[PDB]
């Protein structure tokens, strides 16, 4: 039986989507089907901020942050709990928390 | 485009094809422009340039061989040089 | 060995697979507003003093 009306992906009017390699296992998955997430984090782990501020030469330093996009295959995303199995009624919740 | 302007000059204005007719018209001073194919011999191209400098005629170097020049002019043979005597309805003479 | 004295300011909660250790946050007597996340093998409660052989490490999450 059809589990999802989207077929577990996001592809209506395409036919084919260029694949992406998973960040954990390097499994090839269609780009639209991935569990892509955005990781935007401080470079100093938010714990050594005091030490970096006191050891900085330059005052009022910007303290940049790192930006990347993690593309998860379905298996790796479920395993690492980026997403999880939901009840059937609330599988339809497109809204993130 | 150059091909569209050349087709318009073919349909409306006056044109001659070929080295001998082009040189004769350059001698008579009736040539208003000359288009020279890209693969024409350098000696013939330089002689045509000398004639056009003597008669104050504009020289346009087509971006193609004699086959492409003939196709642009609308013929099914090779054209090395084409002299435009008058444009009529095109702007090929007025521009460039 | 350089020994540093720190006092627990909040017992964050028990952690570890068997729960035998407790994550706490400790404040240093010198350099006010300097706190470090440490772990406890035995019991630990509010207002408790502390000896650390080294203090340049943190433990953020355990699973």
């Amino acid at each position: 039986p059809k589990k999802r009306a989207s077929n577990g992906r996001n592809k209506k009017g395409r036919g084919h989507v260029k694949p992406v390699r998973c960040v954990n296992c390097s499994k090839s998955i269609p780009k639209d089907k991935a569990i892509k997430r955005m990781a935007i984090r401080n470079i100093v782990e938010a714990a050594a901020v005091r030490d970096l501020s006191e050891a900085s030469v330059y005052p009022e330093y910007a303290l940049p942050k790192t930006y990347n996009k993690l593309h998860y295959c379905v298996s790796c995303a479920i395993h690492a709990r980026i997403v999880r199995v939901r009840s059937r009624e609330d599988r339809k919740n497109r809204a993130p928390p | 485009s150059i091909n569209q302007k050349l087709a318009l000059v073919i349909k409306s204005g006056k044109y001659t094809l070929g080295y001998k007719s082009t040189v004769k018209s350059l001698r008579q001073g009736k040539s208003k422009l000359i288009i020279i194919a890209a693969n024409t011999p350098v000696l013939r191209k330089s002689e045509l340039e000398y004639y056009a400098m003597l008669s104050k005629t504009k020289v346009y170097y087509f971006q193609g061989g004699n086959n492409e020049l003939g196709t642009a002019v609308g013929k099914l043979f090779r054209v090395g040089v084409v002299s435009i005597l008058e444009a009529g309805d095109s702007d090929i003479l007025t521009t460039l | 060995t350089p020994v540093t004295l720190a006092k627990v300011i909040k017992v964050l909660g028990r952690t570890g697979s068997r729960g035998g250790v407790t994550q706490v946050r400790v404040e240093f007597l010198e350099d006010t507003s300097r706190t470090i996340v440490r772990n406890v093998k035995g019991p630990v409660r509010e207002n408790d003093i502390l000896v650390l052989m080294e203090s340049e490490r943190e433990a953020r999450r355990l699973r």
């Binding site: 330059y58 940049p64 790192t66 | - | -």
Partner: protein, 226 residues
């Protein structure tokens, strides 16, 4: 890892830091701060010629450290050594490159990224590639969530940016291009020449790189000019 080397001496001590000596790197005149740091080299024996052995190197220095300004902390400048003059060797422009954090900050979704590149040559025979990055922006009072461009606005923007960059670099020497690049005025020229096509925020000119260089130029002018 300490003792896993199955072999350590296949073929079968002086201190390199003691054997090395310090130099000083001096920026061209186009930047405010002259001293940009120090570098090492082995002492000049008869078979190494430390002078030219070290004259062929480059240093990446932040534009904020070059100009003493906060608003240049997201730029870097490549400086390539050209002369040595008594432990105070002189450098010249190689290429500006943006910062990873800043580029990844201004690349975001629900908007269009526009990239252009031009390989125009200067008046003094420097061949350089300039990369301009612009971003379509959400207007005021707009309710639509994305505000993309329309792939013909993008082409027109790339056309005008290429024309602007060619016009600027043609006629301007490398020093003049650097001197008008620090004030990022070409960004505003692009903003003004584009604003009638799309709003297009964040017109920072991205990296510019030196593809090729002219001759040695070692005679009479860089004393005053760098």
């Amino acid at each position: 890892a300490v003792g896993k080397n199955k072999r350590l001496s296949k073929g079968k001590v002086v201190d390199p830091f003691t054997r090395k000596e310090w130099f000083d790197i001096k920026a061209p005149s186009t930047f405010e701060n002259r001293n940009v740091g120090k570098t090492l080299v082995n002492k000049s024996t008869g078979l190494k010629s430390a002078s030219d052995a070290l004259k062929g190197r480059v240093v990446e220095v932040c534009l904020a450290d070059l100009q003493g300004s906060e608003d240049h902390s997201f730029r870097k400048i490549k400086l390539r050594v050209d002369e040595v003059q008594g432990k105070n060797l002189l450098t010249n422009f190689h290429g500006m490159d943006f910062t990873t954090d800043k580029l990844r900050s201004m690349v975001r979704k629900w908007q269009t990224l526009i990239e252009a590149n031009v390989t125009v040559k200067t008046s003094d025979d420097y061949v350089l590639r300039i990369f301009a990055i612009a971003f379509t922006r959400k207007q005021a009072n707009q309710v639509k969530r994305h505000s993309y461009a329309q792939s013909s606005h993008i082409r027109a923007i790339r056309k005008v940016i290429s024309e602007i960059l060619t016009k600027e670099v043609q006629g301007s020497t490398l020093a003049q291009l650097t001197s008008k690049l620090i004030p990022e005025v070409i960004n505003k020229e692009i903003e003004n020449a584009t604003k009638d096509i799309f709003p297009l925020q964040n017109i920072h000119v991205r990296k510019v790189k030196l593809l090729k260089q002219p001759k040695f130029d070692v005679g009479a002018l860089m004393a005053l000019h760098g």
